[PDB]
């Protein structure tokens, strides 16, 4: 009695993809994780009464032209699209990551959650209203997280599971 969910964490270099994934899985914060390390992590969790196996790919390179990225976008069931709230460029990059994923899926139905990470940093450059507007335009949830303090880390991943579970019934 278990359901599998293949999750992919994408976003510009330095936004906190690794720190979020490691906080979820290993309950610690990494200060300076090698940006080129790409790995998968598995863990069983209970969400809405369901024992869920999360299979999460923490992506490293974000290159347009990558056979491996095409493959993991085909395989991935949901996408955590992460920007940092103090990096406007990373928020602008989100549209490209969504376009790439939709292209690979040949679909509009793609489970995705917009994550504004580094919510513990005081010098915000991306207003929450703008990020909420973007998420509303895409029809996806928006969550601000801190991999440093663990704020909303489980919520971001579990919300993505909920999106996938729902899309399976449509
Ligand atoms: C690793 C298996 N895997 C995938 N396998 S895969 O497409 O062949 C793939 C994708 C990216 C990769 O970098 C790799 C890969 O070669 N690796 C990382 C994943 O284990 C190796 C791992 C050993 N060190 C170098 C990188 C494989 S896709 C995937 C998704 Cl979308 C979610 C969860 C997964 O576990 C997953
Ligand atoms: N203050 C703060 N720093 C973070 C947060 N998440 C990641 N970082 C830091 O930002 C840098 C990049 O994080 P990393 O996870 O390696 O980014 P990735 O390239 O997206 O995998 C590192 O120095 C992290 O310690 C966060 O929520 N808050
Ligand atoms: Mg990383």
Swiss-Prot record:
Q: How does it associate, per the subunit comment?
A: Interacts with PHLPP. Interacts (active GTP-bound form preferentially) with RGS14. Interacts (when farnesylated) with PDE6D; this promotes dissociation from the cell membrane. Interacts with SOS1. Interacts (when farnesylated) with GPR31. Interacts with RAP1GDS1. Interacts (active GTP-bound form) with both SHOC2 and PP1c (all isoforms) to form a tertiary complex; SHOC2 and PP1c preferably bind M-Ras/MRAS, but they also bind K-Ras/KRAS, N-Ras/NRAS and H-Ras/HRAS. Interacts (GTP-bound form) with MAPKAP1/SIN1; inhibiting K-Ras/KRAS activity.
- Function, in words: Ras proteins bind GDP/GTP and possess intrinsic GTPase activity. Plays an important role in the regulation of cell proliferation. Plays a role in promoting oncogenic events by inducing transcriptional silencing of tumor suppressor genes (TSGs) in colorectal cancer (CRC) cells in a ZNF304-dependent manner.
Q: Where is this protein chiefly located?
A: membrane
Consequence of changing residue 14 to R: In pylocytic astrocytoma; somatic mutation; increase activation of the Ras pathway
Motif (Effector region) positions are: 33-41
Bilayer topology term: Lipid-anchor
Q: State the organism named in the record.
A: Homo sapiens
Q: What is this protein called?
A: GTPase KRas
Can you summarize the PTM annotation of this record?
A: Acetylation at Lys-105 prevents interaction with guanine nucleotide exchange factors (GEFs). Lysine-depalmitoylation by SIRT2 promotes its localization to endomembranes in endocytic pathways.
| Effect ascribed to mutating residue 61 to R | In CFC2; characterized by a defective GTPase-activating protein sensitivity and a strongly reduced interaction with effectors
Residues modified as N-acetylthreonine? 3
Annotated consequence of substituting residue 13 to R: In lung cancer and bladder cancer; somatic mutation
